[PDB]
C-alpha cells in the first residue's frame, strides 16, 4: 500500500534547480548526508543518555557507505534516532519549506550550492548525482517506513517489508549515469577524508567483492 504526496511548493522549487544547473561540484552531496547522519546519531546519542533503552535497539553509532557497481547505487546507512511516519510525511517537509526559500534567496545574493547545508536542506544536494533516492528509515517510536522520490513534484510513503533495520536510516541513491565515479573506492575515500575528516562517529566503506 502506497501513498503518494506533492513537495511543498518551495521544496519542488529547488529539486528542479539541483537537477537542472549545470555545477561540476557534485561531491558535496557525500559530505551533506554524512552531516545528516551524523546529526541523526546526535540525537539518539543524548536522548540514551537519560534513557539507556533507547538503545535497546542498536547499541552501535556508525556509518556505512556501500558502493554497488551492479545496481549502480551508493548506500549510505546509519545507526542514527530514524524517522516516523510523520516526519516523512509533515514535519522534514514543514521545516525543508522555510529553509529552502532562504537557500534560494542567498543563491541570489552571491551564494553558491556548496552552502546549501547552513540552511539545513542540504539532503536535496543528493539529485545532483541520483535520478532516484530511497530512504529506508526506522525510529523507535513507530514501524519501518520506505520514502522515495524521482522528483518530478511527488514522493511516496510506504510501510517497508524488507529486511528490519532495527533503528537508523539507510539513503540509497539510484545514480545518474555519468556519475558512477562515486562508486569507485579511491574516490569515496578522497571525498571523505576532504569534506567528513572530524566526523565524530566511524564511517566505514564497504568494499565490493
Ligand atoms: N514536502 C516534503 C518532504 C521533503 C523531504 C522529505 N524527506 C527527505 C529526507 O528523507 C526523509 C523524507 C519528506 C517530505
Redesign the pocket.
Known sequence: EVET????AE?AQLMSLIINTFYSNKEIFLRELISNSSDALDKIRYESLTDPSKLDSGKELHINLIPNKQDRTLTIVDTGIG?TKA???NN??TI??SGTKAFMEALQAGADISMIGQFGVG?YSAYLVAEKVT?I?KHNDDEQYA?ESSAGGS?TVRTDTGEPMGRGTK?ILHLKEDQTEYLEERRIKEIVKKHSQFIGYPITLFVEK
Open positions: 504526496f506533492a513537495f511543498q521544496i524517522m516526519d516523512l510525511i522534514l517537509g525543508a519549506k539532503f530512504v528509515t520514502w514522493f539513503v
